[PDB]
Each structure stands twice: as structure tokens, then as C-alpha cells.
Amino acid sequence: YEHVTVIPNTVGVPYKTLVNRPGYSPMVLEMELLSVTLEPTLSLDYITCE
Amino acid sequence: LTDMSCEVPACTHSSDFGGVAIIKYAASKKGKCAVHSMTNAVTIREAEIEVEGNSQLQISFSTALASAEFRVQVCSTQVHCAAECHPPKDHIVNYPAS
């Protein structure tokens, strides 16, 4: 059973979702964001030194 | 059979028995009683069950209607069942039904 849910991009806050599959007893899932990675696509122009 | 009440804790209108019904009763003696739906839209999985006195029975039922008001004939006495069945997850099934 596929369960789709939307949670805010906030690390450290636990969010609870109710999974209700028709004909089956409800299920509660606790989700918490531990860390969020944003890697930018880079293009080296040049390098500077002494 | 006397004092009869019908409670539907779970119902999902599908090709198979997606409904559960609990029927309370007051029996005169220990014996076998036939179970049959008096409504042509609802079908019961159980053909016959055992009764004693002041007890209950769990039955599996199949229906297509969302709002299902059906009469169940246990032994020789009838009971009215109120059910608000919900749609299933699948639109196409792999087995035929009534």
C-alpha cells in the first residue's frame, strides 16, 4: 500500500501521519528530519594563489 | 431467536466479502441455525452457525451499494442491518461476483 504525505522542511520536529488502508486497521507513522543536502552544479572559472 | 440487534463495524463494497457484521441474540436452546440475506444485493459467506442463549455471532458479507440496508434471516427470525460501506483501492478485480 502506497502512502503519500507532505511534511515541512524543518529538521528536529517529529510529524505523525495516519495510514488508513480501506478494510484494514489504521497505522500511525512518526517521521523526523535529521538532516537536509543541497549540492550545487559547479563550473570552475579559475584558481588563485601566491 | 429473540432480541436481535445488528452492528456493522467494518464495510468495503467490493467483489469479495469486504463487510463484517456482529448480530446479538437471545436463543431458546443449543442448536444449528441457517443464515441467509433477505436482500438480493447482499450475500453472506456463512450458510449455518451454532446458537445457545444470550450470545453474539460474526458474519462476512459482500455488497456493491455504498449505503446498504439489508435484512438477515437467522434461523426463522429476521434482523435489520445498517451499513455505510466504502469504495475499494482497486478499480479492476481478478475474480467474478454476483
Next chain:
Amino acid sequence: RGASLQHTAPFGCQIATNPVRAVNCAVGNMPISIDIPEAAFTRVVDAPS
């Protein structure tokens, strides 16, 4: 040069290197799909009222 992005960036951003990317950053939402197996589901009837 002063302070880097690790110290000056908003939303409490943590800046990592090799490759360069931003870790832990509060902003916007995020969708999550969970395909729970039928082996972890229990029929209602098998339950109580």
C-alpha cells in the same frame, strides 16, 4: 575575507566541502512516499470495537 557562508548564511545553514553543498536548511516543504508491505497490515474485522 571575513566570515564564510557557514557563519553568515540564513536558516541555520551548515556549509560542507569536497563536494561543496549546504546541509541542514529550513525552507519549503518536502513530499515523502512510503510503500508499506501488506505484511504489516491487519484487517479491521480481526480487531475490536
Next chain:
Amino acid sequence: STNGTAHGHPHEIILYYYELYPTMTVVIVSVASFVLLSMVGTAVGMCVCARRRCITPYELTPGATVPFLLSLLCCVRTTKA
């Protein structure tokens, strides 16, 4: 597939169309049109009846007005002048 939700109110009502259908809704629409015609016919009859009431008083002199107003409207608007 297609979910035939109940309501509500109406809304989910048209959703059923998809469930068991081609038809269904069109017949209901025709019935609604018939109902509207009945409503329109009643109104037309009522207006003619209102004339039937206003009659006599159409010939003619002091005596409503008064009626008027009590007057459905038409009573009054002859009453003028």
C-alpha cells in the same frame, strides 16, 4: 477505479455518474427540466388566477386600490390615477 463519493452536498453526487452510468445523469436532467416546466406552468396559472381575482374590480370605481394594499403585487401595481 473512478471513485463515486457520496457528497457533499451534491458535488460527489455527480461523481457517481462514472460508477454503472452512460445515461443516469441525462435522465435526471430531463426530470429536472420537467419539474421546471411544472414550476413554470404553476406560475403562469397563478398569474392568470391573479387576473381572475383582479377581474370584477376591473369595472370599476372606488374599491381598490384598497385591495391593492392586500395584494399580490398585481393589485398594487394597478392602484394608477
